[PDB]
Amino acid sequence: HSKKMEEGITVNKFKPKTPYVGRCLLNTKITGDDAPGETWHMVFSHEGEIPYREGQSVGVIPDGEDKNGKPHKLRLYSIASSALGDFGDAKSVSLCVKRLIYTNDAGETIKGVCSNFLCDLKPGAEVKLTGPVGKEMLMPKDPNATIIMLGTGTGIAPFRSFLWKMFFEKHDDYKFNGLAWLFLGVPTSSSLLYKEEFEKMKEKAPDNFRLDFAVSREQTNEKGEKMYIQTRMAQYAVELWEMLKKDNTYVYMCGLKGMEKGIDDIMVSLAAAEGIDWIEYKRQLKKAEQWNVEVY
Numbered sequence: 586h587s588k589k590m591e592e593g594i595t596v597n598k599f600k601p602k603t604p605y606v607g608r609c610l611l612n613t614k615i616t617g618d619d620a621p622g623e624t625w626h627m628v629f630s631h632e633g634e635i636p637y638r639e640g641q642s643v644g645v646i647p648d649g650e651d652k653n654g655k656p657h658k659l660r661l662y663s664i665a666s667s668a669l670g671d672f673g674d675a676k677s678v679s680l681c682v683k684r685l686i687y688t689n690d691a692g693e694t695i696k697g698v699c700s701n702f703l704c705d706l707k708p709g710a711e712v713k714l715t716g717p718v719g720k721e722m723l724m725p726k727d728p729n730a731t732i733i734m735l736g737t738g739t740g741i742a743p744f745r746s747f748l749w750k751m752f753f754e755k756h757d758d759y760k761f762n763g764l765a766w767l768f769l770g771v772p773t774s775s776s777l778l779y780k781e782e783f784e785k786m787k788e789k790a791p792d793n794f795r796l797d798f799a800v801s802r803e804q805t806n807e808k809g810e811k812m813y814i815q816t817r818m819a820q821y822a823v824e825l826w827e828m829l830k831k832d833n834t835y836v837y838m839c840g841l842k843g844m845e846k847g848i849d850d851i852m853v854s855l856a857a858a859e860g861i862d863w864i865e866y867k868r869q870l871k872k873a874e875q876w877n878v879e880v881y
């Protein structure tokens with residue numbers, strides 16, 4: 586039935602009332618000092634106890650209590666490592682986390698609870714995890730699929746997951762031969778997350794991988810408009826539209842809730858030109874499992 590790799594997945598092996606307690610291995614800042622805000626890549630040991638698949642998320646229960654003396658609510662994080670992991674032994678899990686900092690109503694600076702707890706982790710520290718969670722973002726079963734990946738900021742996480750499996754690993758029963766096209770929206774060149782990894786993949790599989798960046802604060806289109814991901818998409822409109830008409834094309838979108846609208850704004854117009862109602866078409870794609878979304 587499913588077009589996705591849904592068979593034999595684990596879900597909620599670990600729950601909030603009984604989390605898995607793993608330890609931090611590494612925690613590294615991956616953005617430049619230049620960047621607006623910090624993004625960290627961190628890796629935790631789970632010794633093989635969390636049997637996740639690419640596209641899933643884990644919950645993190647940050648240490649401390651809420652204002653009622655209760656444990657904090659879990660926050661979800663997309664897994665940024667493939668099922669084997671960054672060390673290739675299936676015993677670790679990696680997260681890509683932005684440090685959240687804001688000012689409240691009174692001009693006071695507020696730190697996000699889980700995000701700062703995580704970004705401040707030192708190797709050796711323990712962490713409470715739950716999950717795995719999710720089915721929405723699992724990869725398609727078709728090894729020859731066209732997969733378009735639309736991410737903003739940390740939303741690159743699941744795509745990193747997919748791509749490590751696809752291009753940096755050897756699997757007995759899986760060999761990717763389709764076309765993978767990634768579009769990644771970040772603010773600055775010093776925020777191009779995992780670029781070095783993607784450049785290595787591109788060299789390995791030149792015919793199978795396409796890569797496009799939309800550096801919002803540094804790039805403008807012809808009209809001198811800000812280079813959002815949708816902005817960069819339009820430059821490929823005809824092509825993308827055509828890909829969308831095929832049954833073996835899968836779209837995945839992950840990141841800021843805001844990107845969803847912008848994309849719909851470009852699509853409405855693309856389709857109307859062919860006399861198609863984007864809203865119905867999209868509904869059909871969602872149902873056929875070809876249009877997959879995880880925004881937050």
Ligand SMILES: Cc1cc2c(cc1C)N(C[C@H](O)[C@H](O)[C@H](O)COP(=O)(O)OP(=O)(O)OC[C@H]1O[C@@H](n3cnc4c(N)ncnc43)[C@H](O)[C@@H]1O)c1[nH]c(=O)[nH]c(=O)c1N2
Nearest residue numbers: 660661662663681682683685687697698699700739742881
């Ligand atoms: C499915 C899915 C998957 C992911 C994520 C969410 C979900 C649902 N997230 C987001 C993550 O779960 C979490 O919400 C953030 O890390 C922030 O949590 P803290 O506990 O740090 O903030 P905390 O919960 O302390 O504060 C959050 C609150 O900040 C407030 N806020 C934010 N900006 C504000 C502003 N400008 N002004 C006023 N108030 C403001 C809002 O009130 C908001 O509810 C994520 N994140 C991530 O970094 N990487 C990832 O991979 C993922 N993956």
Ligand SMILES: Nc1ncnc2c1ncn2[C@@H]1O[C@H](COP(=O)(O)O)[C@@H](O)[C@H]1OP(=O)(O)O
Nearest residue numbers: 737738770771772776801802813814843844847
């Ligand atoms: N509504 C939106 N649609 C598309 N891209 C967006 C939207 N809002 C913000 N962005 C961009 O998503 C990226 C998020 O990356 P990061 O987490 O490091 O900030 C930035 O390039 C940000 O651009 P900008 O902040 O210049 O508006």
